[PDB]
Design a protein around this ligand. Structure first.
Ligand SMILES: Nc1ncnc2c1ncn2[C@@H]1O[C@H](COP(=O)(O)OP(=O)(O)OP(O)(O)=S)[C@@H](O)[C@H]1O
Length: 771
């Protein structure tokens, strides 16, 4: 079992050990000073790895002094392992919180910024508060990212050398960090290196659901209303149209009416894009479309119509604000709720780190997933002292009452013997149910229902001592330790001889992993302990995932009340049920990660092409590129497409971005598509020269960024929410052999081209059409 991987690793610790004595003589400052010595050496030569022995050795004595926690080889091996970029499988109570110190320090010497992710706020704040004396003492700084944290403070934390926090906030922050307008609000920093505590939990387990930021539609609510009232008051002269090419615009009569109606007196400018966009689809919905032709009004809602059948294309909603507009138009309750803006799985958010790593107590079994996703290599480490415990069997039953009384009675029994027990549950109500019998009978205990992880954290530590009964859910008091004695050497041996801590799990969990975690809370290093599972036939995991066996047994009749069950075949069935929800879950992540890849490739560019604008990167060759793009398109459409519809081609460009009287070109019949476009484009290069010369190349470029970036946001968020609705729409399909994913990709590919186009034709319009 990973013998040589650990053996070679052992050579590293072997060296760390020889060094120890030399540093022993050193003062507190002779040690801090070393952080610098380190940094400077890194510039002169040596790799982070070439430093490893001394680096960790320095964390050893500094740790060995400010917290007492000197480090044990296993805690060193694991330290090296995190730095090597893998998983550090150590069992509960093995000291993982400290296995991290040595590795952060080492990597934090680059000034880049290390990341330590935990399962929750408390776990992170506590983790940082504990090891900070080691970090601080060595000339480094630490910060932790907690929930509802103001931007000002939040910035400072990533600024610090080391940073801790809930997995939810790191990936969350990021979203806002890339979703934000200017940089006065970006909060993150370079995602360089991360250490994931309880890696199986965040990565493998959470994976199932993605992170999603949404937005409260207060603004939009009365916005379509105002726009719709105005478009309503508007006259035929206030706008011009063309149902032939499905376009419409607001004439000069409208610009002023809008400025007079609203308090906005400028319009057309990037500042206002909003009122303008809204009044736009408000107008289009009012005249370009019509009742019973385009869209239809059934009951209290407005459904869309398909042109290929005349049927109602249900499920699908109108694009970029349109439906919301038609709704306002007719006079029906508007769907203004849950706006999905940001979204991301941990499968990818974590892929975004130069060097990934983590620790846990159960991962080598899921290695194939950890590697073929995060290319995380699980390396198992030996436990410090030999692990002696009693991982007892699964007391099998039928009927929850039978299972429950068996549990209640076995607890009164262990309790009198004087030993503590840990009753693991998997529901706040089940924990209360099991609680009722104990109270009904008269035996003291406390309920840890994962809500105030800190208050409960204290409770579980004490739980580990003398006559205590603690019923915790599978998420209550996690990183806390079960010290036999609760801090006393007296109760330590008393409870040590009595046979450790006892663990009883209500039902078999969703995986062997979660179960061994209840089993793991006991028997650390060198402590006796027992753990047993009181299972029953109606427990869902078996009830639904068991098979034909549990069914007939459950159906039969009734006989031996309170009498437990057994059989070879019975167990053979109980295990398939768990490995069945194991595989069920294996594939739910598969069909969540892929659906994200599609949006991840998109979100990838929309983001780079968003960051260009922010870090003052030149966008002139690119805007000009898309400007040419619009025209090359006009080419295939009217130029070549229909045949040579000059009136249309020109209407399209006047429609799109060209001014009023400009594209006048001789030749036409004598000239070819390309030449005609080269001309239309030179005519455009001139239009921009008029702009630069009359505005100043600087405002011209400065303005280039103001509107490119602004329209991306408007059309991107809407493309995202809509890409989600697209997924929901595939649900009502299947066909002969049409993969539900395949369709989603195609209808998502062109949907991306439509989005990008809505940007091409929009940056330019604002950049040329009016000024
Ligand atoms: N080398 C050590 N010497 C003394 N105490 C130690 C040492 N290492 C860890 N501890 C103690 O062990 C307890 C912490 O164990 P943890 O770090 O929680 O182990 P773990 O359960 O693997 O970690 P989590 O829950 O993934 S942080 C604390 O009471 C520490 O004081």
């Amino acid at each position: 079992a990973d013998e040589q991987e650990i053996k070679k690793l052992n050579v590293i610790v072997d060296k760390i050990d020889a060094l120890e004595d030399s540093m022993k003589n050193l003062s507190y400052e002779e040690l801090k000073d070393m952080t610098a010595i380190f940094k400077n050496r890194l510039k002169k030569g040596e790799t982070l790895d070439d430093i490893l022995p001394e680096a960790f050795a320095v964390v050893r004595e500094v740790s060995k002094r400010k917290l007492g926690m000197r480090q044990y080889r296993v805690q060193l091996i694991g330290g090296i392992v995190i730095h090597q970029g893998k998983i550090a499988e150590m069992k509960t109570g093995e000291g993982k919180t400290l296995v991290e110190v040595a590795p952060v320090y080492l990597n934090a010497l680059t000034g880049k910024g290390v990341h330590v992710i935990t399962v929750n706020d408390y776990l992170a704040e506590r983790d940082k508060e504990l090891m900070s004396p080691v970090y601080e003492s060595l000339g480094m700084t630490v910060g932790v990212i907690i929930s509802n944290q103001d931007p000002n403070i939040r910035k400072q934390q990533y600024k610090c050398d080391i940073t801790y926090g809930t997995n939810s906030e790191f990936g969350f922050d990021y979203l806002r960090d890339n979703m934000v307008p200017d940089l006065s609000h970006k909060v993150q920093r370079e995602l360089n290196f991360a250490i994931v505590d309880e890696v199986d939990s965040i990565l493998i387990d959470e994976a199932r659901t993605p992170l999603i930021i949404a937005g409260d539609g207060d603004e939009d609510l009365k916005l379509y209303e105002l726009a719709n009232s105005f478009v309503k008051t508007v006259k035929e002269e206030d706008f011009e149209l063309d149902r032939k090419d499905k376009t419409i615009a607001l004439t000069a009569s409208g610009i002023s009416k809008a400025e007079s109606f609203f308090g906005i007196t400028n319009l057309t400018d990037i500042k206002n894009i909003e009122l303008y966009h809204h009044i736009n689809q408000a107008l289009r919905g009012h005249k370009l479309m019509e009742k019973d032709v385009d869209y239809v009004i059934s009951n209290g809602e407005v459904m869309i119509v398909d042109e290929f059948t005349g049927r109602v294309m249900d499920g699908r909603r109108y694009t970029d604000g349109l439906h919301q507009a038609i709704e306002a138009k007719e006079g029906v309750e508007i769907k203004n709720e849950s706006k999905t803006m940001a979204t991301v799985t941990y499968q990818n958010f974590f892929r975004l780190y130069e060097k990934l790593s983590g620790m846990t107590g159960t991962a080598k079994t899921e290695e194939g997933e950890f590697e073929s996703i995060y290319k995380l290599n699980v390396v198992q480490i030996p436990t410090n002292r030999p692990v002696i415990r009693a991982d007892l069997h699964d007391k099998v039953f039928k009927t929850e009452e039978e299972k429950y009384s068996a549990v209640v009675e076995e607890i009164i029994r262990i309790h009198k013997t004087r030993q503590p027990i840990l009753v693991g549950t998997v529901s706040v109500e089940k924990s209360e149910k099991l609680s009722k019998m104990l109270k009904k009978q008269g035996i003291k205990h406390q309920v840890l229902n994962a809500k105030q992880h800190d208050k409960e954290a204290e409770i579980i530590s004490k739980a580990g001592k003398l006559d205590a009964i603690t019923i915790a859910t599978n998420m209550a008091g996690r990183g806390t330790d079960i010290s036999l004695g609760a801090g006393d050497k007296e109760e330590e041996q008393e409870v040590k001889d009595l046979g450790g801590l006892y663990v009883i799990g209500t039902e078999r969990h969703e995986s062997r992993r979660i179960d061994n975690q209840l089993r793991g809370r006991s028997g650390r290093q060198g402590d006796p302990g027992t753990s047993r599972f009181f299972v029953s036939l109606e427990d869902d995991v078996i009830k639904l995932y068991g098979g034909k066996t549990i069914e007939k047994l459950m159906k039969r009749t009734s006989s031996n009340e309170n009498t437990a069950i057994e059989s070879k075949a019975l167990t053979r069935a109980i295990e398939r049920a768990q490995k069945g929800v194991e595989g069920k879950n294996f594939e739910i992540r598969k069909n969540v990660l892929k659906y994200d890849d599609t949006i991840n490739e998109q979100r990838k560019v929309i983001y780079n092409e968003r960051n260009k604008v922010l870090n003052d990167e030149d966008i002139q060759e690119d805007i000009q590129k898309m400007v040419k793009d619009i025209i090359q398109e006009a080419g295939e459409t009217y130029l070549i497409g229909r045949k040579r519809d000059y009136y249309g081609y020109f209407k399209h460009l006047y429609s799109t971005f060209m001014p009023a009287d400009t594209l006048l070109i001789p030749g036409v019949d004598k000239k070819s598509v390309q030449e005609i476009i080269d001309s239309t484009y030179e005519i455009s290069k001139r239009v921009y020269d008029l702009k630069k010369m009359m505005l100043g190349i600087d405002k011209v470029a400065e303005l280039e960024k103001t509107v490119l970036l602004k329209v991306v946001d408007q059309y991107w968020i809407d493309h995202i929410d809509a890409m989600e609705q697209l997924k929901q729409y595939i649900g009502l399909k299947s066909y002969a052999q049409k993969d539900p994913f395949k369709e989603y990709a195609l209808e998502g590919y062109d949907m991306f081209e439509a989005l990008n186009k809505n940007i091409r034709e929009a940056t330019v319009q604002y950049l040329y059409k009016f000024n």
